[PDB]
Point group: C4
Amino acid sequence: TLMFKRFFGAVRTSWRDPSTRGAVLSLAIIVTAATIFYTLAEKWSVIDSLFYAVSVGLPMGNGPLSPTLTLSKIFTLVYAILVVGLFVTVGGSLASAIVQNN
Amino acid sequence: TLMFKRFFGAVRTSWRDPSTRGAVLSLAIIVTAATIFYTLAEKWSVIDSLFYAVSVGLPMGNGPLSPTLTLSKIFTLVYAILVVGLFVTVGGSLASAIVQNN
Amino acid sequence: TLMFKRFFGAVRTSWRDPSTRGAVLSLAIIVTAATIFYTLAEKWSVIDSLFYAVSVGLPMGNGPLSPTLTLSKIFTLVYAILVVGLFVTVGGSLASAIVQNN
Amino acid sequence: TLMFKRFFGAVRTSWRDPSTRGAVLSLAIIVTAATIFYTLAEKWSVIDSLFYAVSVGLPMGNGPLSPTLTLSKIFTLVYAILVVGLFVTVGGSLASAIVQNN
Ligand SMILES: [Ca+2]
Ligand SMILES: [Ca+2]
Ligand SMILES: [Ca+2]
Ligand SMILES: [Ca+2]
Ligand SMILES: [Ca+2]
Ligand SMILES: [Ca+2]
C-alpha cells in the first residue's frame, strides 16, 4: 500500500535537479557507510540498520534499536553531526519539490 | 480545556495564507496517507496511528509505538524523508503567525 | 552545581533583545499551558509535565513518559505543531547570542 | 572501521573555518559542561554521559538513558534550549563542507 509514496515520493522528487542536491549523493554515502557499520558492529539486520541510521539524522525515532557498545556509541556521535546537515537540506529541497509539483 | 489551544491554535493561525501556505494542504494529504497505512498495516488505532505519522517529521516523540513489520519499517523512511521538510515550513509559518498575533 | 548554567546561560542570553524575541513570551505562554494540561490531564508532576512539554518541540527526547489518554494524545498533536517554530527561533536567537559572547 | 568516518569526517571537515564557526568552540565548552554534569549527577559512564549530552542537540535519540533525578531534569531543559542552535549551525557548516569536497 506504499506504492503511492515510494513512486510519487523519494523517486519522484529525485528527478528534479540543481547542483547543490549533490547533497543527496553525500547523504547516500554517509547513510550507507552508517548502515554498513550498524549491521556489523551491532549485529542487526539491514533494514533495522538503515532504520537506525536514518533515525539519528531525522526526528523519526529509533524503535527498540539504539547502540550498546562504546564503538558504535562514539560512531553514532561522529556520524550524527555529519549527517544532521545532509538530511536537513535534502528534506528542504525535497519539500519544495512537492509544492512545485502542485 | 484543550480548547484554547485548538481554537487559539491550529484553527486560528492556520488561516493566515500566502500562496505558499498551500504547504498545509500538501501536508494534510501526507499525514492522512500515512495514518491510513499505519491503521491497516500496523493494525493500530486511528489516534495512535496518527500519533506515529506526526511523530516522524517533528520532535514530538513516538510512543511505545514503532513499526514492527518490514513494510512499516521501509515505508516509515520514505514517508519520513519527505514530510520532515513539509512539517518545518508550516511549523515556521504558524509560529510566525503567533508572534504578530499580540 | 548547575548554578553555573542557569546564570551563565538561560538567564544570561535572554538579557539581549530584538523585536523578534517577543517569541520568548509566546513560547513561555505555550509551555505553561502544556504543562498545566499534563499535570491535570495526565496526572504527572510539574517537572515531568514541564519536561514532556519541552521534549515535544526540541529534539532532546522524552525518556519513559508518553501520553496515555486519547485526549492528551491529541493535545500533544495540536500543541506539537504550534510550539516547534517558536522553539526554533528562540533557540536560534539565544544560540547566536552565545557566539556574540566570545 | 569508524576511522573512515572519524578522520574523513568530524575532523577532516571540522577544520574548515570562517568567523562564524566560533560556535564549535562554544559547543565544545557546553557539550563538555553537560557531560561532566551527567557523569556526576546521573551516575552514568562518561561515554553514555557524552551520548546523552549530544542526543539532545541532535535528532539522534538517547538510548534507554534519560534524567531520573529532578536536578538533571531541571538542568536538561535549560541546556537543551542553549545547545540546540549551536548543534544546528555547526551541522550546516559541516554539511556544506562535505559537498564543497567534490
Ligand atoms: Ca528527535
Ligand atoms: Ca530519531
Ligand atoms: Ca525517540
Ligand atoms: Ca519524534
Ligand atoms: Ca523530542
Ligand atoms: Ca535527539
